[PDB]
């Protein structure tokens, strides 16, 4: 079941939810090479834009499928398929924000289809999200732990402030398997290097082109 995922291999996703209570919906179309780590999307703020608050912090929100994995660690999220996963993220800001995602990934007809709910709460009005002065995210090194059938993922990321400065935050990840009826082969504790750069922006970020490069490595 790893045949499902090809060299090439096209996404939709639709984002729908809220940060300090304003709502938005977004919609992303993109593609990778899954077995490169390589992968690019074009997002459109489609309702509730322009946001109040920076896209950065649904950046990383946005494709667990497109992770280089080498022959050595067993890629969890390939051999969901066709089924695919779930994830729940809880990411916590050092100045009090709290954001709460959950993702289900599936496959229909060759493309991965992906929702996502987003609610950020208790943002400080006058800190660097609220006010839009973020310059993306500094790469980061997630750590994944075998878990009942699942992984739990460990990041701390530091999220770039206008003027210099790192606004610092971290989150806590489970991916659970919807696969049942077939075989799952679990890796050991490893770690995913990820950078996550914006090559594109327009029109108060309701338009956004960013490109993901994660690598699974031995710990």
Same mark, same amino acid.
């Given at each position: &079941? ?19 209570? *304003?709502?938005?919906?977004? @919609?992303? /179309? #993109? ?14 703020? %489609? ?9 950065? %912090? ?25 089924? #695919?996963?779930? +994830? ?5 800001? /050092? ?6 995602? @959950? ?32 310059? #993306? +995210? /500094? ?17 701390? %990321? ?6 210099? &400065? *790192?606004? *610092?935050?971290?989150?806590? @990840? ?7 009826? &077939?075989? %799952?082969?679990?890796?050991?504790? *490893? ?14 970020? @309701? ?13």
């Amino acid at each position: &079941g790893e045949e499902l995922i090809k060299e090439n291999m096209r996404m939709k996703v639709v984002m729908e939810g809220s940060v300090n209570g *304003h709502q938005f919906k977004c @919609t992303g /179309e #993109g593609e990778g090479r899954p077995y490169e780590g390589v992968q690019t999307m074009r997002i459109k703020v %489609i309702e509730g834009g322009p946001l109040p608050f920076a896209f950065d %912090i649904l950046a990383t929100s946005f494709s667990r499928t497109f992770i280089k994995y080498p022959a050595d660690i067993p890629d969890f999220f390939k051999q969901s398929f066709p089924e #695919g996963f779930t +994830w729940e993220r809880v990411t916590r800001y /050092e100045d009090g924000g709290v954001v709460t995602v @959950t993702q289900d990934t599936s496959l229909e007809d060759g493309e991965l289809v992906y929702n996502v709910k987003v609610r950020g709460v208790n943002f400080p009005s006058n800190g660097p999200v609220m006010q839009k002065k973020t310059k #993306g +995210w /500094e790469p980061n090194t997630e750590m994944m732990y075998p878990a009942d059938g699942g992984l739990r993922g460990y990041t701390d %990321i530091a999220l770039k402030v206008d003027g210099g &400065g *790192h606004l *610092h935050c971290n989150f806590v @990840t489970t991916y659970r398997s919807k696969k049942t009826v &077939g075989n %799952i082969k679990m890796p050991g504790v *490893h770690a995913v290097d990820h950078r996550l750069e914006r090559i594109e922006e327009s029109d108060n970020e @309701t338009y956004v082109v960013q490109r993901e490069v994660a690598v699974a490595k031995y710990s």
